[PDB]
Write a protein that binds this ligand. Structure first.
Ligand SMILES: CCCCCCCCCCCCCCCC(=O)O
Length: 371
């Protein structure tokens, strides 16, 4: 309740009106004055507030063996807190920077449409539901590629808190040296035993944030398996297979694989292999090449004009193996579209063989009947 905060402010004012105790009350009150001064923001406000409190306390302030020591305790506790706030602020800034690397521009058009719609809803308002439902869909689409960062933040924070506890224990002088030595000794033993798990976690972090072979929604190829990335985390990546089975891969194994990424690929190519009889006249082979050229040229929304036909080999004297190399106008992120276009090309090849009378026969077999 703002009223309670205001009451506390009033109480502090009363303490001053009725001076170190009042100054202390002003700090104890956790006054919103810093927020007003500030009207990353809240990490900055805390940092400033702590800094002011420390400076005030030191300026505000016989029994060196008995009570003076409490002043040392307080001095250093406040300092530890300020160190903590500082590191906290640094952490936040760096993680925000990291997160920006996960912004995807694939949503640029959706973002611009949403900005326009929300701008007009501020003045022409009095369709609207679609705008808000699309806004929600976009916010989730963008937040889905930042889940690894949120996880890293939790991990880093836990480490940071522990580091600050240790700093407090040391800087205030509360810890003694025999316990510090036993503490460090046990930590080394723990590292010895569980260090290998930490190595794995760290390597997974490098894979996800530095190597970064894929993002969410990309269609990737791993060990010949074409899979869509559903989500990314620090320890695991979740993929959908072509039949939509959900598959969980340890990042520790993906870190050692060659990963294809269709989303990021340039227009991809393809191959149609076939065979014809050895006796097919070279003239029909020439006609086949011309017919194919015309087909591809009549369908430039699907095919680039560059293609090659390669004659590979003569098997016995019966078969000629050939292959047609073509180039699609798309990459293979939309796999179904790729197959539909290829399917039409295969049927065109069928048609050409029929029209040009291209066949394949089996070698003849000689029979001798004994009776
Ligand atoms: C804080 C240390 C925990 C030990 C595991 C190291 C990774 C930090 C925890 C982040 C979650 C990793 C991904 C698991 C899947 C999920 O979160 O749903």
């Amino acid at each position: 309740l703002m009223i309670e905060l205001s009451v506390f402010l009033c109480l502090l004012g009363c303490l001053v009106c009725s001076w170190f105790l009042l100054l202390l009350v002003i700090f104890s009150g956790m006054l919103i004055t810093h927020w007003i001064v500030h009207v990353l923001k809240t990490s900055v406000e805390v940092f400033i507030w702590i800094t002011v409190v420390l400076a005030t306390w030191v300026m505000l302030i016989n029994q060196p063996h008995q009570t003076r020591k409490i002043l040392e305790f307080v001095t250093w506790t406040i300092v530890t807190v300020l160190i903590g706030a500082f590191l906290w602020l640094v952490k936040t800034t760096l993680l925000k920077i990291l997160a920006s690397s996960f912004h995807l521009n694939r949503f640029f058009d959706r973002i611009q449409e949403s900005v326009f719609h929300h701008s007009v809803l501020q003045t022409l308002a009095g369709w609207v539901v679609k705008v808000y439902n699309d806004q929600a869909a976009l916010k989730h689409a963008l937040n889905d590629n930042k889940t690894a960062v949120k996880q890293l933040n939790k991990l880093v924070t836990a480490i940071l808190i522990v580091m600050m506890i240790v700093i407090w224990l040391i800087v205030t002088g509360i810890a003694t040296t025999k316990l510090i030595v036993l503490l460090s000794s046990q930590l080394v033993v723990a590292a010895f035993i569980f260090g290998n798990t930490c190595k794995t976690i760290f390597e997974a972090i490098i894979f996800v944030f530095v190597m970064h072979p894929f993002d969410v929604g990309d269609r990737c190829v791993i060990d010949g398996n074409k899979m869509l990335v559903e989500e990314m985390n620090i320890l695991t990546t979740v993929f959908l297979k072509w039949d939509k089975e959900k598959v969980y891969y340890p990042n520790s194994i993906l870190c050692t694989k060659a990963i294809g990424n269709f989303f990021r690929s340039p227009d991809q190519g393809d191959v149609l292999e076939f065979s014809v009889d050895f006796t097919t006249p070279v003239l029909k082979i020439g006609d086949l090449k011309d017919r194919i050229k015309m087909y591809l040229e009549q369908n430039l929304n699907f095919w680039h004009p560059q293609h090659n036909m390669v004659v590979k080999e003569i098997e016995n004297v019966n078969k000629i193996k050939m292959a047609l190399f073509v180039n699609h106008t798309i990459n293979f992120q939309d796999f179904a579209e790729k197959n539909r276009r290829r399917s039409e090309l295969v049927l065109e090849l069928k048609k050409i063989f029929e029209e040009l009378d291209i066949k394949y026969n089996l070698l003849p077999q000689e029979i001798s009947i004994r009776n």
